Design a protein around this ligand. Sequence first.
Ligand code: NAP
Ligand code: NAP
Ligand code: NA
Lengths: 348, 349
Amino acid sequence: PVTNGRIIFNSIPTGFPVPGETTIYDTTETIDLDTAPLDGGFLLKTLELSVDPYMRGGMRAPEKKSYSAPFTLGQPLRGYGVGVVLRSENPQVKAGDHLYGFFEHTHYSIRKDLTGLQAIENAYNLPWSVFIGVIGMPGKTAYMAWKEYAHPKQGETVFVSTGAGPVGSFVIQLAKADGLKVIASAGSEEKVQFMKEVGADVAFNYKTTNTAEVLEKEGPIDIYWDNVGGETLEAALNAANVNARFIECGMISGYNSGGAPVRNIFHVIGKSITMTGFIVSRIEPKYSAEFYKEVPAKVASGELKYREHVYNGLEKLGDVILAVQKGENKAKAVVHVADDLEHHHHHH
Amino acid sequence: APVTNGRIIFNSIPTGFPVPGETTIYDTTETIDLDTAPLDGGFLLKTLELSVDPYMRGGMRAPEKKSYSAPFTLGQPLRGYGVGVVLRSENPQVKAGDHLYGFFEHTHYSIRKDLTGLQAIENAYNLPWSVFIGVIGMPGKTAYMAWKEYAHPKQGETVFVSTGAGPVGSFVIQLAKADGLKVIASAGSEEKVQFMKEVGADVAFNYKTTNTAEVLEKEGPIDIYWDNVGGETLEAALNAANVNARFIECGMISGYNSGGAPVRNIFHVIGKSITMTGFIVSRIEPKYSAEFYKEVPAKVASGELKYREHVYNGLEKLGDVILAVQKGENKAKAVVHVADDLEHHHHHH
Ligand SMILES: NC(=O)c1ccc[n+]([C@@H]2O[C@H](COP(=O)([O-])OP(=O)(O)OC[C@H]3O[C@@H](n4cnc5c(N)ncnc54)[C@H](OP(=O)(O)O)[C@@H]3O)[C@@H](O)[C@H]2O)c1
Ligand SMILES: NC(=O)c1ccc[n+]([C@@H]2O[C@H](COP(=O)([O-])OP(=O)(O)OC[C@H]3O[C@@H](n4cnc5c(N)ncnc54)[C@H](OP(=O)(O)O)[C@@H]3O)[C@@H](O)[C@H]2O)c1
Ligand code: NA
């Protein structure tokens, strides 16, 4: 029998998550990989777990019942991941199958069927982590909301906040393929270099650069991709062109402080702005087939560039959640939970 | 026999609300002889009705921060929408008695070289001339055109209309009911609540004596929000919004006299997948202008489209009417009656 560790949602944070208090790591549960009773289901080994900015918002008290369900106190966290089937008594599932979907933040789970899971099409033998990033929900977010809401015209100017993340860096590349001038900002020099590498025309570190002054010089802006909200949205509103489109994807500047105010929303009227918020899952059905047919080949060839920040060990996941909220992840945050016994064979 | 050609002059930039007598002054030093004034191929135009609109506060600022539109010039007459009648014309296309709609300086008389900025009024139903600066004027166009452009209504949805008793909001209420929507609407007085009910609001309340969030909780969620107010009312609508709501951003009067009104819960735009569209009526008007003038007059004449107005008599009051509109003290669409029209006048005892 081996350890089946779990990352537990333990207490509601007031500001930023507190690793070891907000989330705890539990190693008291075990599983026998050969003996675990499957009951016609299958044994699924967690390989890669995504850590995403939205996880902070699920750390709240239980309130009525809405579409947005908070994490349950005392239960494992959960989110997108990749796993492999070790042992199956279910005819739809074969040992060695790699599956994508929501995973509890544990080493192993026993699933009765494929509800919530999809077989992964990996024709290019890409690292499994790409299916929770550029070929996962963050890539879908950029791909689908851009096509749905940007209405880009060649020669217009777009401002992308958090341009070095998995969403923003995808958006930059879609915007350049449409012939737009791209302004993008991130929180470190290494992220600025990546933004230039994926083709940002103006790439800057918002911690060492006056954002409003850059937008004044390089704008006005026809499209704002909002990942930050707050003062950065205010800056975009001040620099907006008439008939600008504001794609409201995230507002991370308020995730750990109860939201961030906007004081100049009147520009939406004065400048005839269309500001559209979206949740990627709501618009994905229209685009999922096209996304999975188009994106893997471009990741394999380098047409679509990506970066990731891999953290090794389920026990780090709580710290990784804080790292993302604090902007300390260098790129898309991946918790590598376990290896797959193929490609990475352990030997001395 | 020269008569006073009075003028409302923009005199100083206000800090909060306009101050009649300081922000605006009434100047009676100019005279005009209606019979002898040189027209020089132009025509003499007599001001009949002037609109006072909420946006006028926004033009009362320094000329440097010139933003979307043009600010009023210090020392010059104010201006805005109005109706006037031609008294005397040396212009072959313009005839005495012609009634014209467009931008008017806030004066009793003007000499125009041509019809620039003006359009003949089609008044087949002999409606009061003031309807062409309200329900059949820019405020009615605002409701008519933005609703058709942005509401994408579906039968049985719920709309919340702020400032529901004004010329914009009460027009919106009627469009929404015609589309089969449930309508919630709020205004600032009991008399305005009665009017909102008269034009068919299903839920009509006075937001000053009734908590908006409580009404929206009981009567929502809301699929469409028509924003005339911004600020805490926009915040309340965001919290009560349905998934895929449409927020039509028309005005935000709660911040016109206080440097804007903040919004603290704009994150609801993401969580509830809201489409929030701001607009300026003059930008979308060309697309709808012909259909508007073809459809609306007959409905005003028949009572199908209902309207109210609050008439103030006398050009010298206009600055006070501007403050009144900002303070919510106008009972309905604010109209300054400048002069009567002599179309059917015959002097006799
Ligand atoms: N369906 C949706 O609407 C949807 C879907 C996916 C993602 N999102 C949102 O997209 C945004 C980015 O997602 P992602 O997967 O690409 O995450 P990410 O870029 O890998 O991580 C979040 C990044 O946000 C930056 N950040 C943290 N605090 C900040 C602050 N106060 N001010 C400015 N930047 C801050 C940090 O990068 P810097 O170096 O730039 O500071 C951090 O690395 C998030 O806001 C997410 O909530 C929305
Ligand atoms: N192109 C455009 O975007 C466009 C065009 C025309 C008009 N508008 C806007 O539409 C709105 C209504 O225009 P209207 O012609 O129909 O004017 P209106 O209703 O005749 O007059 C303004 C009204 O706003 C209400 N009000 C004033 N201060 C308020 C405050 N702090 N909080 C809440 N309500 C307040 C008042 O009525 P109650 O408080 O009693 O309800 C006041 O009567 C304005 O915001 C205007 O700027 C926009
Ligand atoms: Na950072």
